[PDB]
Amino acid sequence: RHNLSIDGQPLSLAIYAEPTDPKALLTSMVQASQGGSAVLPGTLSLYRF
């Protein structure tokens, strides 16, 4: 009834649908918004330019 031989050996070759390969993992650089310095009013020097 279970498709076996008289000795118990199976008569139908099975299948398993092989697992899907290795995996690629990558990393990336990340940048963010950056500001600059400000300018203040200047002092008056005692010396010439």
């Binding site: 940048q31 963010a32 918004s33 950056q34 500001g35 600059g36």
Partner: protein
């Protein structure tokens, strides 16, 4: 229709030969863009002014 088929074959073979992924070739040529001022652009403008 055969022109489309031969075009698809040429491009896919070229991508495999040049080791360029499907995502990579899309990023290089697509006209679709985010429309947001990315931090890369913001940093470019701040250093440029």
């Amino acid at each position: 229709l055969p022109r489309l088929v031969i075009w698809l074959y040429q491009v896919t073979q070229w991508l495999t030969e040049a080791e360029i992924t499907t995502e990579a070739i899309w990023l290089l040529c697509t006209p679709e863009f985010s429309g947001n001022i990315s931090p890369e652009i913001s940093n470019l403008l701040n250093n440029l002014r």
